[PDB]
RNA sequence: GGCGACGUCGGCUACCCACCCGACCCGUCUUGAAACACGGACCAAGGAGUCUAACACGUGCGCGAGUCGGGGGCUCGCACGAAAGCCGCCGUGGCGCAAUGAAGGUGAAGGCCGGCGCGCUCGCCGGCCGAGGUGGGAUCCCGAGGCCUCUCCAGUCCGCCGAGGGGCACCACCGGCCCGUCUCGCCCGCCGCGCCGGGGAGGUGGAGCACGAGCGCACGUGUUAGGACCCGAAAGAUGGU
RNA sequence: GACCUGGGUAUAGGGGCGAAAGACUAAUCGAACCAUCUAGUAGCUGGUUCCCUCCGAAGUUUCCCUCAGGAUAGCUGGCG
RNA sequence: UUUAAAUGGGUAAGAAGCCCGGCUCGCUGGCGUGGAGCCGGGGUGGAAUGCGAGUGCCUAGUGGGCCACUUUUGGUAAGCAGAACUGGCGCUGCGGGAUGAACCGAACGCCGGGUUAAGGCGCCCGAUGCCGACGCUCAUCAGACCCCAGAAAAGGUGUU
RNA sequence: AACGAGAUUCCCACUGUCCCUACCUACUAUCCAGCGAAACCACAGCCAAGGGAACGGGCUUGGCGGAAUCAGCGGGGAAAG
RNA sequence: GCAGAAGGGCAAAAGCUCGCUUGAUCUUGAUUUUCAGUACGAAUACAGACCGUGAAAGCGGGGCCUCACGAUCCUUCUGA
RNA sequence: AAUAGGGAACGUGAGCUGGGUUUAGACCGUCGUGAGACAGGUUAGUUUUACCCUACUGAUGAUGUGUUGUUGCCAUGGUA
């Protein structure tokens, strides 16, 4: 019916994006993946062993096993009615370092090197993060010019 | 209309024995009399396990008792088990520990008396620690039917280990094709 | 047919087995029927022993069974030569003999 | 008990309990173990792999007897005795270790399992195992062959 | 606080009637039936999930590393007694207590200490215990501290308690053990020196071990074989008129 | 007149007889009638008997000589 | 197809974390290197909202569906054929749409008082029996309330 | 050639087949004395339109709606078998 | 241009020419794809061997990737 | 005068007829090895029931006027 053949609706995914073709530069490769390290999936088009399969494109998943080539991956991967943790085996050149836990990697630094400087004086900082107010009570200023009035313009073709 | 529920909502425990055994029903009404008044969680263990089914409720050993007691502590304090006392032959010598059981069993009632020990009922348990202080209350291993090693995800799937029901062990009966790699396949 | 988790059963009831049923309501009716029997023989033999004659030592053959002594049919013929008693008038002092049992 | 069972509680419920569009009838699938190859095939693998071939050596006429060995390991090996004997030894007095003959017990073969405690012992068996016969010796024990 | 007799007071159902409002004939297959879909004129009686065998799980009971006389036997000849009771060197046997390999066959205990062989990735002796360790874990133990009509002197009690400890069952993980195979390697033993026996170290296959939970009995549910919830073919065969 | 007809007699069921229509064989014939195997089989139609309380679907996945049927996963309830 | 939304998909928002010191290794190897494991130790307030959760066994029925916005394929089209997302009908009464499977409101234990939703208020028929406001419209085929149950191009010195 | 209870076309003769129907006769039907069934039947029985399983008798909105019956009749009951 | 259908990919190249070769070999598991998360087929990352090639880093267990195929029973050959 | 076109379950078989189509006999042509096939041709081929309910058509009568009779009026329906 729907032909479930391996690299299938990938025209445009498994392409290299648009004048960035050739051969791939190297500090790809001079990266370094440990275990749980997370990592985003982005499988390339010029490296053909090790590409996962295109349901796993664009998600994230936690380093388990590390290879001459290759790190294993467990990625959450979304079955009819269930998630399941799969394990997969990717090439290096088809992941990267995800920046999403490096934004609570720094306020994990940035609050407990702000938690003992109140701590040696005394204060209340409260370094939990609350979302966006309601904006303050201010006070515009309209010196001296007036507010220019505005109106909507007529109809034309 | 309010919701869009699933309707759980009617906890499915239980709240009074099934069996009709007048003795263990004096149990029930000496202990729902002491978890409803004496603010211990002791009692509150003991009463739901006077609940249970005998499958819940398995048989512990003499030789899991004097290993779970020769622990660091343990060794003045009282040994509680909703369940009964079966003897292991396995076991040399006895201590002379304190035990407390429904139906401790004939050899191995024998063998805690010679060795100098008490076997307590839940009755003279309660006027001795109401409260339940100083009492080590253990549990058999309820995981160890042989009901429980054919239960898992299928034989057939792959690293399963699940045991099929088959009606003779041997040769021929459940061993050709999705056992082993010739044969068609290994699973 | 089948269904989940299960025994593969291979019940042998594929023939007309309802007409050869055995019920064994007579079994009360049989025991004291074959008591009843041994009674009225034990004192037709009145002095004699009931159960009949001494049987032989006999120790079982396989490698399941061959550390037990059961009794046997009858003596070998050689032992009621070195016993000392002849074989024809071994029967009726009441004496079991067989004669094609080997020592 | 009548009484107790499903169908005078059904009574009344048109269907008895089958359905209006399935309406069981009486032999839907087959009869017995039909169609284990062709469409009660994913029933028998996940619950019966291993159902369907040949897998062994044919033996004509065997007997449950020539193959006959009941086991013991050494946990149960001094109930095979009296109590008032694993206690009678054990009282300093020589080296005189008493006979444990398996074969009059029920049991051929003798094999391992820990915890032998520290007493000499003679055992009669007909068969051992390597480990049973230096859990024995561990002991100052004498593992003597009988047949 | 007031009012009312020999025909009046109160009352309701399978009573009858009247009015307002609402209201199509049920069963059935079906996406959908009031249907121009089928069955049904009316009434009484009959009328359809049963038993038996096997298996699974749940529950109750008895005993419990065992368990069960079901087959026999015993008792004086008793209606009820085609019962009940008993056996025990009648437990033969069944199921469980050990797995594993096609088979030959083999066949589940480790940790701490001290010593020395090149403490040489390899090891050996002896003692001490003895079913490992990690993370959670009901319960229990200890608990600084704290809690009452006048301040210093002391003991049961009680409740709050930060923290600490031992951790049941179970879950996840690591380690070990047994059987089959695979690679790698050296050593040991002699009912007799071999196209012998035994051992090691790694990885793997198993329905395994890692201080046992089964058995018998009853019931409920599910499935299967039997006429199998009930009724229904066109047929096929055997022997006859 | 290859005529009409009585009684007697012969042929019998995968057989008979047929100036042929698959006609006729006891109101039955492209295989009689009786009894038995037999309560044969049906994934197909019809029916399936008391009350109240609580929960409550699916018509989709994968395989099948599969397409009016099953097995399997989902959905449900019950027990904990 | 260079570019490229909205909607959407994964992940993270802590003690299973952060840090320090030490021991193991037969892997790695200029290196007391690298990395894994292991032991001991140090300090918990780490988005908003809501909710008690975890897990096992047994398991019936079902495996013909249909509909409506929105997005879509085949088709001249269809109360047609086939998909996507959500809701509903089937399994579901009730108020309204006169009528009704699916529209619109709202889901239902048995009743009294109150108030509304969608829709309405000449009379059938509850409620405008308001001294309702401003305009438009004359039909010899007037018009008249989602789905929805009848119309187009073109034209009129008919009137605004 | 002869012969067909065979198929077909024309012509003569003849006629109610037709124009186009009419009248008479018997036996009924019809009424009475006697005797007397059966098929069939959810409940039943006046319509127009609407909706609806797209062609209602019942339902909605209209039209309207007097007992009890007799001889006929073939539209309907998607009439019966 | 890359054997052929398309799409993706590729320039001191994955294309052209040349020199060597047989890794298109032996063996155990895991993972992915379809999926019930079963099998086949195809594939990925290893590991232990024995090898090729290159100065070496290395690369290589069939074809630049996406297809090119097949249970039980039976038969045949090979293996200790 | 004109010989307009349609509808009413392609109005109308318990109203008819049975020519056609559309069973079983037979013939011919083509097709098929054959049994047989062919909106290809030809020929011969059982057309059941109303006494029910309504509708329609006629026939008595019913309600009301105290009873009963004669003479009348026209609501409404048909209409040439
Ligand atoms: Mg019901
Ligand atoms: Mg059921
Ligand atoms: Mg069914
Ligand atoms: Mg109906
Ligand atoms: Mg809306």
């Known amino acids: 019916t729907n032909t479930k053949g391996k690299r299938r609706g990938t025209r445009y995914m498994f392409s290299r994006p648009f004048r960035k073709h050739g051969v791939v530069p190297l500090a790809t490769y001079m990266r370094i993946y440990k275990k749980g390290d997370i990592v985003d999936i982005k499988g390339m088009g010029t490296v053909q062993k090790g590409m996962p399969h295109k349901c796993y494109h664009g998600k994230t998943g936690r380093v388990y096993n590390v290879t001459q080539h290759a790190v294993g991956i467990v990625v959450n991967k979304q079955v009819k009615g269930k998630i399941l943790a799969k394990r997969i085996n990717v090439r290096i050149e088809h992941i990267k370092h995800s920046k999403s836990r490096d934004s609570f990697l720094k306020r994990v630094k940035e609050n407990d090197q702000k938690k003992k400087e109140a701590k040696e004086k005394g204060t209340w900082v409260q370094l939990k993060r609350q979302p966006a107010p309601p904006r303050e009570a201010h006070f515009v200023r309209t010196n001296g010019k007036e507010p220019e009035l505005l109106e909507p313009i007529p109809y034309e073709f | ?187 | ?103 | ?147």
């Open chain 3, 1 to 103: 047919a089948p269904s989940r988790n299960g025994m593969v059963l291979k019940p042998h009831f594929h023939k007309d087995w309802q007409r050869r049923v055995a019920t064994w309501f007579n079994q009360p009716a049989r025991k004291i029927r074959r008591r009843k029997a041994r009674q009225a023989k034990a004192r037709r033999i009145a002095p004699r022993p009931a159960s009949g004659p001494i049987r032989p030592i006999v120790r079982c053959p396989t490698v399941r069974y061959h550390t037990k002594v059961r009794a046997g049919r009858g003596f070998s013929l050689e032992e009621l030569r070195v016993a000392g008693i002849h074989k024809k008038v071994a029967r009726t002092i009441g004496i079991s003999v067989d004669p094609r049992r080997r020592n």
């Open chain 2, 1 to 187: 209309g309010v919701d869009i529920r699933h309707n759980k909502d009617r906890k499915v425990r239980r709240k009074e024995p099934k069996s009709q055994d007048i003795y263990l029903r004096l149990l029930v009404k000496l202990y729902r009399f002491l978890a409803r008044r004496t603010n211990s969680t002791f009692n509150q263990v003991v009463l739901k396990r006077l609940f249970m089914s005998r499958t819940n409720r398995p048989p512990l050993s003499l030789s899991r008792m004097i290993r779970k007691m020769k622990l660091p502590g343990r060794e003045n304090k009282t040994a509680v088990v909703v369940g009964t006392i079966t003897d292991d032959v396995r076991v040399q010598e006895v201590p002379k520990l304190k035990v407390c059981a429904l139906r401790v069993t004939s050899r191995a009632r024998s063998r805690i008396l010679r060795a100098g020990g008490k076997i307590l009922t839940f009755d003279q348990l309660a006027l001795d620690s109401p409260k339940g202080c100083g009492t080590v209350l253990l549990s058999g291993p309820r995981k160890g039917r042989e009901v429980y090693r054919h239960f898992g995800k299928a034989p057939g799937t792959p690293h399963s280990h699940t045991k099929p029901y088959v009606r003779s062990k041997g040769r021929k009966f459940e061993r050709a094709r999705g056992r082993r790699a010739s044969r068609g396949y290994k699973n």
């Open chain 4, 1 to 147: 008990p009548s009484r107790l069972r499903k169908t005078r509680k059904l009574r009344g419920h048109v269907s008895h309990g089958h359905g209006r569009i399935g309406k069981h009838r009486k032999h839907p699938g087959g009869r017995g173990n039909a169609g284990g190859l062709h469409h009660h095939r994913i029933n028998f693998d996940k619950y019966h792999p291993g159902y369907f071939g040949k897998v062994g050596m044919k033996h004509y006429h065997l007997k449950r007897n020539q193959s006959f060995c009941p086991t013991v390991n050494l946990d149960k090996l001094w109930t095979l005795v009296s109590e008032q004997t694993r206690v009678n030894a054990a009282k300093n007095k020589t080296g005189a270790a008493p006979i444990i003959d398996v074969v009059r017990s029920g049991y051929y073969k003798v094999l391992g399992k820990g915890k032998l405690p520290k007493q000499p012992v003679i055992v009669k068996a007909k068969f051992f195992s390597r480990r049973a016969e230096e859990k024995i010796k561990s002991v100052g024990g004498a593992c003597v062959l009988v047949a």
